């Protein structure tokens, strides 16, 4: 049903034989551009930034933090909304109350507040990762995630999805640096 | 000309399953890497022979490590698999089974024959069948056969 109109980028070059870790920075042009078009992020990835283009490491973790309160990235509300699919994801349970409370949340979320920023533990990596739920199906039962890891937009299960969240949400893989993770939103969207 | 390739890196924690990434894919090695927001997981291009080119992507198990099982986002698409333990602890070396089977239960080749999967014994600066296609002893600090091993995995992808 709720599908937004944000233009991908991947962190990889364009032959795909160079992999930066820009999974910040394509993630927040994510969520503040509009209309199938480029948000100006420039002015902080070209002024001499290590970080940006940088084949070893990405943003730092605290420096992250206060960059998101910049850009007025905001945390998603504690809604009760929210609370219960948390507590799901304490249990690391998919069951059909939660797969219909997961349908609701993310498909409350993106009609009121777009396209959400997701900053989780990585999946292949020591580090932290941010990927994008930017639309949503229920006919399939599939979330439109803009992963920059990837080359394009890709439909995944809701329950892949659902697996993303708990590495983010659940006290197993929380670090103490984990701080940040959670689900993020452009705080000037309005529907 | 171009292949992808997704390998899985698991073992127990501190056996040098990050530290062996580091060294193969960015000739690097620490006792301590820091996390930022970058990749969620490693990349390696090789060029395999004068007409192919291999991209090997390299993920390790990272937080699933102290609890040893593996979910589908994680190993889905899998085509090979490093097996890491410490020669230098004895206990590290008992879980290789349990991490073995954990992976024999998960992913497969597309007939149903399992993946590819070396086994590396890592700090040797410092056989059985149980379906490994080979064995190595690698050392991220002094960068022995970590090279050897992965050309080793791609070789047996290959085959497939
Ligand atoms: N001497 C030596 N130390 C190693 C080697 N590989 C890993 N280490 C050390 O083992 C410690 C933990 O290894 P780590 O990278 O965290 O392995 P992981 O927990 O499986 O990811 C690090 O502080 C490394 O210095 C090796 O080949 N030789
Ligand atoms: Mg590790």
């Known amino acids: 049903q709720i599908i937004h109109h944000r233009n991908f980028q991947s962190q990889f070059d364009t032959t795909g034989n160079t992999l930066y870790n820009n ?8 969520i503040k ?19 940006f283009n940088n084949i070893l490491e990405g943003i730092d973790i605290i420096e992250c933090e206060n960059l998101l309160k910049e850009m007025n990235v905001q945390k998603i509300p504690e809604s009760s909304l929210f609370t219960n699919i948390k507590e799901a994801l304490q249990a690391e349970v998919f069951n059909s109350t939660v797969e219909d409370d997961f349908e609701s ?32 199906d229920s006919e399939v039962k599939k979330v439109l995630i803009y992963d920059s890891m990837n080359t394009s937009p890709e439909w995944q299960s809701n329950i892949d ?22 689900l993020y939103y452009d705080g000037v969207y309005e529907p | ?25 960015h000739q690097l090695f620490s006792q301590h890497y820091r996390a930022t927001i970058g990749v969620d997981f490693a990349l390696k291009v090789l060029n395999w022979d004068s007409r192919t080119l291999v991209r090997l992507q390299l993920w390790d198990i990272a937080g699933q490590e102290r609890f040893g099982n593996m979910t589908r986002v994680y190993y889905k698409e899998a085509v090979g698999a490093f097996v890491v333990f410490d020669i230098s602890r004895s206990s590290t070396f008992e879980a290789v089974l349990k991490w073995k089977s954990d992976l024999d239960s998960k992913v497969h080749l597309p007939n149903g024959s399992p993946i590819p999967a070396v086994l ?3 700090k040797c600066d410092k056989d059985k069948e149980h379906g490994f296609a080979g064995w190595f002893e690698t050392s991220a600090k002094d960068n022995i056969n970590i090279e050897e091993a992965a050309r080793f995995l791609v070789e047996k992808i290959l085959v497939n």
């Open chain 2, 120 to 122: 590396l014994a890592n």
């Open chain 2, 1 to 25: 000309r171009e292949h992808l390739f997704k390998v899985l890196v698991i073992g127990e924690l501190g056996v040098g399953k990050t530290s062996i990434i580091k060294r193969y894919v």
């Open chain 1, 161 to 182: 999805v659902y697996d993303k969240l708990t590495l983010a949400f659940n006290d197993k893989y929380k670090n103490e640096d984990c701080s940040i993770c959670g």
């Open chain 1, 105 to 136: 949340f993310i498909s409350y979320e993106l009609q009121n507040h777009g396209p959400l920023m997701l900053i989780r533990p990585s999946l292949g990596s020591e580090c932290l990762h941010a990927e994008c739920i930017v639309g949503y």
């Open chain 1, 23 to 30: 999974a910040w920075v394509c993630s927040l042009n994510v």
């Open chain 1, 33 to 51: 551009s509009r209309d199938g078009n480029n948000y100006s992020a420039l002015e902080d990835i070209t002024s001499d930034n290590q970080a």
